[PDB]
Design an enzyme around this catalytic site. Structure first.
Site, PDB file in Angstrom:
ATOM      1  N   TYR A   1       2.498   1.888   0.489  1.00 32.00           N
ATOM      2  CA  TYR A   1       1.794   3.134   0.451  1.00 32.00           C
ATOM      3  C   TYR A   1       0.852   3.327  -0.837  1.00 32.00           C
ATOM      4  O   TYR A   1       1.286   2.829  -1.781  1.00 32.00           O
ATOM      5  CB  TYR A   1       2.841   4.152   0.183  1.00 32.00           C
ATOM      6  CG  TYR A   1       3.798   4.384   1.355  1.00 32.00           C
ATOM      7  CD1 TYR A   1       4.804   3.462   1.381  1.00 32.00           C
ATOM      8  CD2 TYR A   1       3.437   4.995   2.487  1.00 32.00           C
ATOM      9  CE1 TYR A   1       5.597   3.242   2.432  1.00 32.00           C
ATOM     10  CE2 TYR A   1       4.399   5.074   3.414  1.00 32.00           C
ATOM     11  CZ  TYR A   1       5.505   4.395   3.588  1.00 32.00           C
ATOM     12  OH  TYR A   1       6.240   3.955   4.577  1.00 32.00           O
ATOM     13  N   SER A   2      -0.283   3.881  -0.770  1.00 27.28           N
ATOM     14  CA  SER A   2      -1.413   4.048  -1.962  1.00 27.28           C
ATOM     15  C   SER A   2      -0.983   5.125  -2.909  1.00 27.28           C
ATOM     16  O   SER A   2      -0.125   6.071  -2.308  1.00 27.28           O
ATOM     17  CB  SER A   2      -2.757   4.501  -1.199  1.00 27.28           C
ATOM     18  OG  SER A   2      -3.096   3.451  -0.370  1.00 27.28           O
TER      19      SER A   2
ATOM     20  N   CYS B   1     -10.846   4.211   2.909  1.00 25.25           N
ATOM     21  CA  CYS B   1      -9.244   3.690   3.077  1.00 25.25           C
ATOM     22  C   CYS B   1      -8.654   4.843   4.239  1.00 25.25           C
ATOM     23  O   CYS B   1      -9.420   5.912   4.342  1.00 25.25           O
ATOM     24  CB  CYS B   1      -8.589   4.169   1.549  1.00 25.25           C
ATOM     25  SG  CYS B   1      -6.748   3.765   1.576  1.00 25.25           S
TER      26      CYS B   1
ATOM     27  N   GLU C   1      -9.671  -0.740   2.959  1.00 26.25           N
ATOM     28  CA  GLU C   1      -8.428  -0.903   2.753  1.00 26.25           C
ATOM     29  C   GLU C   1      -7.848   0.099   3.814  1.00 26.25           C
ATOM     30  O   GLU C   1      -7.488   1.332   3.510  1.00 26.25           O
ATOM     31  CB  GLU C   1      -7.784  -0.554   1.333  1.00 26.25           C
ATOM     32  CG  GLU C   1      -6.254  -0.912   1.349  1.00 26.25           C
ATOM     33  CD  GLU C   1      -5.657  -1.070  -0.202  1.00 26.25           C
ATOM     34  OE1 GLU C   1      -5.896  -2.187  -0.788  1.00 26.25           O
ATOM     35  OE2 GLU C   1      -5.236  -0.008  -0.653  1.00 26.25           O
TER      36      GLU C   1
ATOM     37  N   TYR D   1      -5.535   0.662   7.364  1.00 25.04           N
ATOM     38  CA  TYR D   1      -4.111   0.128   8.024  1.00 25.04           C
ATOM     39  C   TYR D   1      -3.818   0.895   9.100  1.00 25.04           C
ATOM     40  O   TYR D   1      -4.542   1.820   9.496  1.00 25.04           O
ATOM     41  CB  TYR D   1      -3.158   0.320   6.662  1.00 25.04           C
ATOM     42  CG  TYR D   1      -3.425   1.665   6.089  1.00 25.04           C
ATOM     43  CD1 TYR D   1      -2.664   2.697   6.802  1.00 25.04           C
ATOM     44  CD2 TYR D   1      -3.708   1.811   4.841  1.00 25.04           C
ATOM     45  CE1 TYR D   1      -3.051   3.981   6.140  1.00 25.04           C
ATOM     46  CE2 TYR D   1      -4.009   3.158   4.376  1.00 25.04           C
ATOM     47  CZ  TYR D   1      -3.619   4.150   4.996  1.00 25.04           C
ATOM     48  OH  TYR D   1      -3.673   5.349   4.426  1.00 25.04           O
TER      49      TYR D   1
HETATM   50  C1  FAD Z   1      -2.333  -0.957   2.083  1.00 26.65           C
HETATM   51  C2  FAD Z   1      -1.481   0.188   2.996  1.00 26.65           C
HETATM   52  C3  FAD Z   1      -1.324   1.399   2.299  1.00 26.65           C
HETATM   53  C4  FAD Z   1      -0.502   2.396   3.067  1.00 26.65           C
HETATM   54  N1  FAD Z   1      -0.725   3.766   2.381  1.00 26.65           N
HETATM   55  C5  FAD Z   1      -0.132   4.772   3.184  1.00 26.65           C
HETATM   56  C6  FAD Z   1      -0.056   6.032   2.652  1.00 26.65           C
HETATM   57  O1  FAD Z   1      -0.809   6.295   1.707  1.00 26.65           O
HETATM   58  N2  FAD Z   1       0.426   6.801   3.622  1.00 26.65           N
HETATM   59  C7  FAD Z   1       0.974   6.651   4.893  1.00 26.65           C
HETATM   60  O2  FAD Z   1       1.656   7.486   5.571  1.00 26.65           O
HETATM   61  N3  FAD Z   1       0.944   5.356   5.195  1.00 26.65           N
HETATM   62  C8  FAD Z   1       0.621   4.396   4.527  1.00 26.65           C
HETATM   63  N4  FAD Z   1       0.752   2.904   5.044  1.00 26.65           N
HETATM   64  C9  FAD Z   1       1.261   2.739   6.288  1.00 26.65           C
HETATM   65  C10 FAD Z   1       2.716   2.456   5.899  1.00 26.65           C
HETATM   66  O3  FAD Z   1       3.072   1.362   5.330  1.00 26.65           O
HETATM   67  C11 FAD Z   1       3.621   2.451   6.960  1.00 26.65           C
HETATM   68  O4  FAD Z   1       3.199   1.429   7.980  1.00 26.65           O
HETATM   69  C12 FAD Z   1       3.658   3.973   7.812  1.00 26.65           C
HETATM   70  O5  FAD Z   1       4.274   4.914   6.954  1.00 26.65           O
HETATM   71  C13 FAD Z   1       4.652   3.688   9.171  1.00 26.65           C
HETATM   72  O6  FAD Z   1       5.985   2.949   8.628  1.00 26.65           O
HETATM   73  P1  FAD Z   1       7.442   3.277   9.520  1.00 26.65           P
HETATM   74  O7  FAD Z   1       8.356   2.623   8.692  1.00 26.65           O
HETATM   75  O8  FAD Z   1       7.481   4.746   9.203  1.00 26.65           O
HETATM   76  O9  FAD Z   1       7.496   2.785  10.681  1.00 26.65           O
HETATM   77  P2  FAD Z   1       8.057   1.636  11.507  1.00 26.65           P
HETATM   78  O10 FAD Z   1       9.333   1.940  11.583  1.00 26.65           O
HETATM   79  O11 FAD Z   1       7.586   0.419  10.574  1.00 26.65           O
HETATM   80  O12 FAD Z   1       7.437   1.575  12.699  1.00 26.65           O
HETATM   81  C14 FAD Z   1       5.836   1.530  13.004  1.00 26.65           C
HETATM   82  C15 FAD Z   1       5.526   0.698  14.134  1.00 26.65           C
HETATM   83  O13 FAD Z   1       5.585   1.433  15.322  1.00 26.65           O
HETATM   84  C16 FAD Z   1       4.486   0.873  16.210  1.00 26.65           C
HETATM   85  N5  FAD Z   1       3.772   2.364  16.477  1.00 26.65           N
HETATM   86  C17 FAD Z   1       3.290   3.095  15.539  1.00 26.65           C
HETATM   87  N6  FAD Z   1       2.633   3.875  16.429  1.00 26.65           N
HETATM   88  C18 FAD Z   1       2.806   3.887  17.570  1.00 26.65           C
HETATM   89  C19 FAD Z   1       2.333   4.369  18.649  1.00 26.65           C
HETATM   90  N7  FAD Z   1       1.509   5.745  18.623  1.00 26.65           N
HETATM   91  N8  FAD Z   1       2.914   3.992  19.935  1.00 26.65           N
HETATM   92  C20 FAD Z   1       3.824   3.064  20.009  1.00 26.65           C
HETATM   93  N9  FAD Z   1       4.046   2.474  19.027  1.00 26.65           N
HETATM   94  C21 FAD Z   1       3.466   2.892  17.884  1.00 26.65           C
HETATM   95  C22 FAD Z   1       3.718  -0.074  15.362  1.00 26.65           C
HETATM   96  O14 FAD Z   1       4.032  -1.375  15.560  1.00 26.65           O
HETATM   97  C23 FAD Z   1       3.932   0.400  13.999  1.00 26.65           C
HETATM   98  O15 FAD Z   1       3.815  -0.905  13.092  1.00 26.65           O
HETATM   99  C24 FAD Z   1       0.056   1.923   4.338  1.00 26.65           C
HETATM  100  C25 FAD Z   1      -0.136   0.629   4.859  1.00 26.65           C
HETATM  101  C26 FAD Z   1      -0.914  -0.243   4.132  1.00 26.65           C
HETATM  102  C27 FAD Z   1      -0.897  -1.699   4.534  1.00 26.65           C
END
Ligand code: FAD
Length: 296
Positions: free
Chosen positions: A77-78, A254, A294, A296
């Site tokens: 998370y940024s 971003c 950046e 994602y």
């Molecule tokens: C460099 C970087 C910085 C980030 N900064 C932020 C930030 O500032 N704030 C922020 O909120 N997030 C940010 N993220 C994203 C964060 O890391 C997570 O990926 C995000 O919060 C969701 O993860 P989760 O664990 O909630 O979901 P998970 O349990 O990991 O599930 C998400 C997964 O479900 C699937 N999915 C997602 N959407 C759908 C859909 N509509 N339909 C079907 N399948 C779907 C995808 O495979 C996805 O990878 C950042 C990511 C990166 C790489």
């Protein structure tokens, strides 16, 4: 020998194997009840232990075990705060989280693991932090550079970190006197994030800060086209292009992965009018630390 503030970058100080355990101090929903989904702003205590700087990210390990009995891998998370933090005491770290909720074709409403943990955290609960992590989105060393920041949704976070430092803080090394232009893209109005904060910096320094919002569900352009971030940028094409032909101009991007193409298009059209191929021009810019992405 680099154009970015990195002298002494601490990185990967805390590993996911044994992360830093902090406390949740605050957690607030910052989007209207009308908005397409909810985004939260949270402040964590780190007691000065997590040595991050503007543009970096920390990783979080959510509580629990996975479908197969093992504990969750981290999510990045940024950082939405400056180095000294929202309290100014250099003892907190803040995040801008979007609550992932959707429904799969099996008809089931699915909740993202980490984002719901973060969004459901209560003041006082512990959170396992890892990092800091990141060197791409660091600020330019030159306190007079033109800093163009293009973000969508939670992509606003590292830019809010840049701006609190540039316009809300008094630092004896960094006295920003260049131009900072921000473009933020969101759906509805109830999705704008940190607006008050951003508007205040405009009035506090009309000479150094430019602010442009882009609400795609309520704003239309020339031809009545939906106002996406590239649509708003377009209205400044010739200028943005001119600024890009300068050497002290740094562009940062971003947010959601899908934003890059939309902007590219703009950049293409806008580049040929000067007889240039966006594709390879961008390659030179990147190599010159002036086009940083950046998404994602
Ligand atoms: C460099 C970087 C910085 C980030 N900064 C932020 C930030 O500032 N704030 C922020 O909120 N997030 C940010 N993220 C994203 C964060 O890391 C997570 O990926 C995000 O919060 C969701 O993860 P989760 O664990 O909630 O979901 P998970 O349990 O990991 O599930 C998400 C997964 O479900 C699937 N999915 C997602 N959407 C759908 C859909 N509509 N339909 C079907 N399948 C779907 C995808 O495979 C996805 O990878 C950042 C990511 C990166 C790489």
């Amino acid at each position: 020998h680099s154009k970015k503030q990195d002298e002494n970058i601490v990185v990967n100080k805390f590993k996911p194997k044994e992360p830093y355990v902090g406390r949740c101090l605050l957690n607030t929903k910052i989007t209207g009840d009308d908005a397409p989904g909810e985004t939260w702003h949270m402040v964590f205590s780190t007691e000065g232990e997590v040595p991050y700087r503007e543009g970096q990210s920390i990783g979080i390990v959510p509580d629990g075990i996975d479908k197969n009995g093992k504990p969750h891998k981290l999510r990045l998370y940024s950082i939405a705060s400056s180095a000294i933090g929202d309290f100014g005491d250099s003892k907190t770290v803040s995040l801008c989280v979007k609550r992932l909720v959707y429904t799969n074709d099996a008809g089931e409403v699915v909740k993202g693991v980490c984002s719901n943990f973060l969004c459901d955290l209560k003041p006082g609960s512990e959170v396992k932090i890892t990092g800091p992590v990141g060197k791409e989105m660091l600020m330019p060393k030159d306190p007079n550079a033109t800093v163009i920041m293009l973000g969508t949704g939670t992509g606003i976070a590292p830019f809010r970190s840049f701006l609190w430092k540039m316009f809300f803080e008094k630092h004896e090394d960094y006295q920003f006197n260049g131009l900072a232009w921000l473009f933020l893209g969101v759906p509805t109005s109830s999705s704008l994030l940190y607006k008050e904060e951003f508007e205040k910096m405009k009035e506090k320094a009309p000479e150094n800060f430019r602010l442009d919002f882009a609400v795609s569900r309520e704003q239309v352009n020339d031809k009545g086209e939906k106002m996406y971030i590239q649509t708003r940028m377009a209205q400044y094409a010739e200028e943005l292009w001119e600024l890009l032909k300068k050497d002290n101009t740094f562009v940062y991007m971003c947010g959601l992965k899908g934003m890059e193409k939309g902007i590219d298009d703009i950049m293409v059209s806008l580049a040929a009018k000067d007889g240039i191929d966006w594709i390879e021009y961008k390659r030179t810019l990147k190599k010159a630390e002036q086009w940083n992405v950046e998404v994602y």
